[PDB]
Amino acid sequence: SKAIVQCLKDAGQRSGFSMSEEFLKKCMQFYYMQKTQQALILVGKAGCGKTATWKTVIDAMAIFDGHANVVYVIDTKVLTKESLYGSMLKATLEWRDGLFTSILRRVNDDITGTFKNSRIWVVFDSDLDPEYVEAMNSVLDDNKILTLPNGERLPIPPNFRILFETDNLDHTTPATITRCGLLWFSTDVCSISSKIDHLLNKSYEALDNKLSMFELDKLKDLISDSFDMASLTNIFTCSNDLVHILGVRTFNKLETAVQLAVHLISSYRQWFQNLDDKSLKDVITLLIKRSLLYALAGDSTGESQRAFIQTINTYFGHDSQELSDYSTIVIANDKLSFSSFCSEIPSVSLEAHEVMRPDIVIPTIDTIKHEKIFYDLLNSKRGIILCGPPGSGKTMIMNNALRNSSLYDVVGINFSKDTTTEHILSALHRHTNYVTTSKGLTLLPKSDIKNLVLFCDEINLPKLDKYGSQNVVLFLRQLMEKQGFWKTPENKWVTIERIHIVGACNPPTDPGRIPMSERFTRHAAILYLGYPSGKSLSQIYEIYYKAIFKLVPEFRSYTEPFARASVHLYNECKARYSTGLQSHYLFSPRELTRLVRGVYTAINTGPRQTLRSLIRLWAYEAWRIFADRLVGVKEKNSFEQLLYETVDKYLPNQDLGNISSTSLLFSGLLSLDFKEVNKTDLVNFIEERFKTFCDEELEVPMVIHESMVDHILRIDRALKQVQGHMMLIGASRTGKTILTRFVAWLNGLKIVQPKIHRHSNLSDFDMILKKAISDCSLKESRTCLIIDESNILETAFLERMNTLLANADIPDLFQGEEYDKLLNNLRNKTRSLGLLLDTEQELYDWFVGEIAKNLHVVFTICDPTNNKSSAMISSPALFNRCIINWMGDWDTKTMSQVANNMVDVIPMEFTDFIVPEVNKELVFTEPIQTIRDAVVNILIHFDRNFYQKMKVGVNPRSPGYFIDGLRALVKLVTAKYQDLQFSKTSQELIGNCIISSIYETYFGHLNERERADMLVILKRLLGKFAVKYDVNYRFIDYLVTLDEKMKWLECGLDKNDYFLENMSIVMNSQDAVPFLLDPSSHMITVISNYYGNKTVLLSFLEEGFVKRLENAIRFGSVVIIQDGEFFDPIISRLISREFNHAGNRVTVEIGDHEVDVSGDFKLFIHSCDPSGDIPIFLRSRVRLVHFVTNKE
Ligand SMILES: Nc1ncnc2c1ncn2[C@@H]1O[C@H](COP(=O)(O)OP(=O)(O)OP(=O)(O)O)[C@@H](O)[C@H]1O
Ligand SMILES: N#Cc1c(C2(c3ccc(Cl)cc3)CC2)nn2c(O)c(Oc3cccc(Br)c3)cnc12
Ligand SMILES: N#Cc1c(C2(c3ccc(Cl)cc3)CC2)nn2c(O)c(Oc3cccc(Br)c3)cnc12
Ligand SMILES: [Mg+2]
């Protein structure tokens, strides 16, 4: 025993470990246990000392036995099973060995090298699960054999031993536990003081060799004694009650303290040589206090730090130099006259246009000290985590700190829900290079001489597996702790050279955030950033307003009240519109930065202003920033009241009028320069242009309305910004996708709409995006890429769109040989434009900038509560770029205007009784007038009643039925009038056509009893107004002639009146596709018996469908399509009637097939069961009809 105890002590002394009794006990335990078992399990907290334990035991054995030690360390859960074990390829049988088997192969077959004279230690340092240990269960059994799907058995020699280093056994089985030796590290192995001594000596190993001995000794004892005092321990005990973010235990922060202290002290070595002891001690103390401060309290929220400073100044001796939060040391005049000063703030003289330089920042004390500590921590070669609320200048501080530097270049990697290690490596590929060396296997240096910083933003979102392992965080742990990784297709080790890791995060309490592993976070210097105190925001924005008001110099004095109004508005918005109403009510200071850039642009491209104009403009900007996202009229009304209050407080001027969102239409369309133009003139301009647009493109009947023109102006404001991405939330059947096309047409943008269907995959969405990006860059084509939620049928599409809007590229699209090709194309393009760039970076910057100004992505979303929609809204890459617009739903006034416009064209015979009714009711639902208003009110009231009865609770209630029934009522009324071309019959035609149009539009999916209740609640509305009717009306007898009545039964229709009404609805619809939901198969026969041999039958599951359907429309055939609880989005142009007009022809894009419609075509859809979901696109265009037998 005694010899092993001695060898252990020697190993620990060489490593600089303190041979604590607990450390000794655990080392001896591990030494004895490994003698009779091969599968060891070591469990404990992060930082227990387990890795130190087993490495020290290995070295002790290396001394005592004289045998060699080969070690392999595998962070196993970064890898997949296929990458660890082997697999089979697509068809080739060739077996890819996988890492663990490849090393076992080398351990056995080699017969060259001292593996027989070596112990082989394969360490699986990660959290373990059943699947992985199960895939190797035969290695733990007495077979001691690795069995492979390849049918071969690999015998393991006695030399091969396995260590499961981990932190938890929650998901491990007793079956494995009972075959292993379990070692539970029930405590930390060493003292805080001894860990400090070890860390000191470790850094001395680096710095001592460079430094000359005379300085070296005096310095290292000058630090050791002061740093080792008891009071510091007192301080640690006074740490444990402080409110740390992320919660790393005090034992795991010493690394940060020692490295930052030693780095700082060593930075002044060239000066220190002249000082007296007193001044030197002072400087040493002050640096150690500053490093202790930020090591222990840097994760605390400001006040804690200023309060903790008092404790540090109290528990150190009062003679020692006092520490203040602002204190910084500056080398004044000659060497050694250091000055401890604060607020050396440079005054920035921003020119007006520099308001929209994204690299700019205001020199504020907070930012100065953050940039300071950031760069010190980076220079110490420690990892960092910049945690802070959304919009706490986490990135701005980094960008400023590193932009000035010429040494530390940046890569940005914006995480999402499912980022992969492949995404990280694909990011790295553009900047990095791989070199082969025998000594370092594959070294990965960066592609130059500098240092490289990986800014991994949103690091706490990647979705963990069911065991809780989020593998990318383990990969980043591997990169820090091990300085490398395994390349698993090659199975060789990669050492990283000079690359640094920086994290950024939103606090773990926010929605959707995952608590990261302590094993990971222990390696990083965590810092907290907070919102800049409000007042400092008033100073920052006072600078911005003064800069932009250099364009209007007489108004320079008002920059203070403008800034104060801006922050006052911000603060009250953030307070009153919280996330408890809607999850998208988030407000950062970036809302104000958008504000000042918008106000700038508006002034820059505007005419001469007066103060009245300035206030109007500022109100417009405030509206389009803050309030466009709001839903609820009470919220908009309170926003108006808030605006009035803010302006009354700060800008008390005399000629402000209504500030309503619809009373301040600033435009840049009619006039060359941006100014508040008149609504009438806008109306007439939009009418003529939209008519011309419809004539030039397709035939869509749309009636101009004031909401439409407002939303037009909002989309124009979006599309004219340099990098404006819009998102249009709201219902279906409300013009989104045609308004965006219209405004794109006005702006001369190209339009793109992805053509994805039931089989399109990632590869296809990749070809779409590569096409778009190549047009935007090489052709400069300025494309409006329109996306709908239906297009992202898997989350991979959403991750790519996140990468796009987060950056201005997809690295994965241009990797490898495609990168070399791309580089060649850009060289040719640039030289064709006469600007010449040589090195890859310059051209890629040009590339990315051209994308960033020539690509506008617009997301329509029909129902926000859908899980896909919720993911798109919740995506941070989308949310922090997309101007959110809430179109929502149509109001009563808009419905009345649209209805009145449609009703006015139709002739209306005078009816004597329509006037005396007016006096009576006074419900106040439209100005009292004539039949036109009476009809409008009846339609609006019925639509409201119907959406009460259907049980549709919140917002999925598009105006589709309203528009369709209104259009069908013109066809009825004017047809019946032609039939009439009596004195008791003419006037009830109105009521009967009202009823008829309603049955056509609303009744098709109602049960008989629901139809009865509708009929009652309608009938009362007619008798509620002047609309008399046939009291004995019957829909069947009114609409269906006796010949048709028989003809259907001859075709085999069931003699049930409910079926007769349904058949009337489906045959009487013109330009609307019936959707026949009949599980009882029979309809697909009655239709065929009616139309005869010329009835084609098709299916979404017959994979020849698309070509045969094109053929069918070429023939003018009737078509029925089976299996409706399936849809193929390529057919949408048949369903949503649209056809690009031609002179001679009338054409439709059925995919890329620009097919001419043979007129006589008729589409029916059928479906076999009501449990099949109907996509909302179909469900709001298509006439849904149910033949299902009903018990009622
Ligand atoms: N006897 C000792 N004397 C001095 N320092 C020690 C001693 N034991 C452990 N340490 C210090 O504690 C540190 C953390 O322990 P170790 O590196 O083994 O982490 P770990 O327990 O393996 O945690 P993880 O689960 O994160 O891998 C060591 O780097 C070392 O600096
Ligand atoms: N322009 C700007 C901008 C500003 C303002 C600013 C504040 C202080 C100073 Cl001295 C200068 C400017 C203009 C108000 N703050 N600000 C941030 O906080 C950011 O923080 C992030 C970064 C990445 C992800 C997430 Br989530 C949040 C990003 N940009 C900004
Ligand atoms: N005709 C027509 C048309 C209509 C209606 C209409 C509305 C306003 C007016 Cl003035 C006239 C008619 C007929 C009810 N809505 N509508 C859209 O919503 C469109 O964009 C989409 C498409 C799919 C999903 C989503 Br979400 C948006 C494109 N065209 C139309
Ligand atoms: Mg370890």
Describe the structure.
It is built from 46 helices and 33 strands. The protein starts with a helix and ends in a 6-residue tail after the last strand. It is of the alpha/beta class and 1192 residues long. Helix 9 (192-210) runs parallel beside helix 12 (254-267) and helix 27 packs across helix 28 (736-747). Strands 2-3-6-1-7 form a 5-stranded parallel sheet, with helices on one face. Strands 11-14-17-10-18 form a 5-stranded parallel sheet, with helices on both faces. The chain folds into 6 domains: 2-185, P-loop containing nucleotide triphosphate hydrolases (Rossmann fold), CATH 3.40.50.300; 192-341, Orthogonal Bundle (Cyclin A, domain 1); 365-528, Rossmann fold, CATH 3.40.50.300; 702-888, Rossmann fold; 890-1039, Up-down Bundle (Histone Acetyltransferase, Chain A), CATH 1.20.920.20; 1052-1059 and 1069-1192, Rossmann fold (3-Layer(aba) Sandwich), CATH 3.40.50.300. The radius of gyration is 37 Å and the shape is globular. It binds adenosine-5'-triphosphate, ligand ZG7 (2 copies) and magnesium ion. Adenosine-5'-triphosphate is lined by residues 17-18, 20, 23, 46-52, 167, 189-190, 194-195, 198, 519, 522.
- What class would the helix/strand composition place it in? alpha/beta
The total of beta strands comes to 33
Output the CATH homologous superfamily of the largest domain.
P-loop containing nucleotide triphosphate hydrolases
Proportion in β-strands: 5-15%
How many domains would you count in the coordinates? 6
CATH architecture of the largest domain: 3-Layer(aba) Sandwich
Report helical residue fraction.
Answer: 40-55%
Q: What is the CATH class designation of the largest domain?
A: Alpha Beta
Would you give the CATH topology of the largest domain? Rossmann fold
Radius of gyration over alpha carbons?
A: 37 Å
Number of helices: 46
- List bound small molecules: adenosine-5'-triphosphate, the ligand N#Cc1c(C2(c3ccc(Cl)cc3)CC2)nn2c(O)c(Oc3cccc(Br)c3)cnc12, magnesium ion
**Describe the biggest sheet?**
5 strands, parallel
Rough shape? globular
Terminal Cα span: 91 Å
Q: Biggest sheet, strands in spatial order? A: 2-3-6-1-7
PDB class: motor protein
Keywords: AAA ATPase, ATPase inhibitor, Motor Protein
Assembly: monomeric
Entry title: Signal subtracted reconstruction of AAA2, AAA3, and AAA4 domains of dynein in the presence of a pyrazolo-pyrimidinone-based compound, Model 4
